[PDB]
Design a protein around this ligand. Structure first.
Ligand SMILES: O=C(O)CNC(=O)C(=O)O
Ligand SMILES: [Mn+2]
Length: 316
């Protein structure tokens, strides 16, 4: 029974003039992690710690808004199925804050104009921004961070492509077409503290991510995140590690690679005595891209259709 998920330092791919043996070591480590656990800590990404802390501060700033203002940009009011804006708690009573055992989020993605023909299609459309927050304090750093997340997942994808079975003869750029005009939702999540009830409580229940790559920024604090490892049937805890992101593969990556890279069930247990924040970035990818199974098996899957199928099947 493994006690931890692996750590991968990708400095060799971020820094200049790294040896080919160092790069190959990165490739092998990431490939093994993603084909065994579907999860790993990533360090060496080069994103300044001040930028990461600024993102968590944006999460806290948004949550501090009163409920009526947040509800003003509720995801109910977004365009079509773009799913942008404020995702409210399941229960609420007051303008300020959250009831225990609840959560809220701000969700934003790639900015697509309202008059664009694709606007309102799945995960595609204009963002909703809270008008009371100054741009220098919210929208601007979030969009700059989104730029950095896009660069990071492109590097991750190149490492993943170099880690596929050699008999498949996959180029290092096999995944790159998913990163053009992609669905890239990011959430600023606020979890309330646990309640006093004497039953297990979760910030997120048992699930898989549906997309390609997920990039999670955690806040210093209690362990929430756990990863289901089937062979030993055990939940691996994923504590916060300074400087790292938690990376995991989603269902679309698992489909694309014919099961070689695993999309693992995970959950967040609520052991927080105070509000906790997190910021996951999700590469779903170009919703219209037709992905052929990389083992040459001739199977074809459209990213948007796959994710909508997963949403329709993930009901109860
Ligand atoms: O906040 C966390 O620890 C993990 N987040 C998720 O699984 C999610 O937002 O889908
Ligand atoms: Mn998840």
């Amino acid at each position: 029974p493994p006690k931890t998920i692996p750590i991968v330092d990708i400095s060799a791919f971020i820094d200049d003039n790294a040896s080919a043996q160092a790069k190959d070591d990165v490739v092998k480590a990431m490939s093994h992690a993603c084909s065994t656990y579907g999860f790993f800590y990533l360090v060496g990404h080069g994103i300044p710690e001040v930028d990461r802390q600024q993102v968590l501060d944006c999460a806290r700033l948004f949550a501090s808004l009163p409920m009526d203002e947040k509800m003003g940009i509720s995801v109910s009011k977004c365009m079509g199925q773009s799913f942008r804006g404020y995702e409210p708690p399941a229960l609420q009573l007051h303008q300020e804050g959250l009831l225990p055992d609840t959560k809220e989020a701000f969700i934003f993605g790639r900015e697509v104009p309202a008059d664009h023909p694709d606007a309102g299609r799945f995960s595609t459309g204009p963002n909703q921004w809270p008008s009371s927050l100054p741009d220098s304090e919210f929208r601007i750093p979030l969009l700059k961070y989104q730029e950095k997340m896009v660069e990071l997942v492109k590097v991750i994808l190149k490492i993943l492509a170099r880690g596929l079975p050699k008999e498949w003869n996959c180029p290092p750029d096999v995944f790159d077409a998913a990163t053009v005009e992609p669905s890239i939702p990011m959430r600023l999540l606020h979890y309330a503290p646990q309640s006093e009830e004497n039953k297990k409580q979760f910030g997120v229940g048992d699930h898989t991510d549906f997309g390609n790559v997920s990039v999670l920024l955690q806040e210093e604090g209690t362990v929430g995140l756990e990863v289901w490892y089937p062979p030993t049937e055990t939940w691996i805890p994923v504590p916060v590690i300074s400087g790292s992101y938690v990376i995991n593969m989603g269902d679309m990556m698992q489909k694309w690679t014919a099961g070689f890279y695993r999309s693992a069930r995970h959950r967040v247990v609520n052991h927080n005595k105070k509000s906790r924040y997190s910021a996951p970035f999700f590469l779903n990818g170009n919703i219209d891209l037709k992905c052929k199974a990389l083992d040459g098996s001739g199977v074809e899957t459209v990213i948007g259709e796959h994710i909508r199928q997963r949403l329709f099947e993930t009901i109860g």
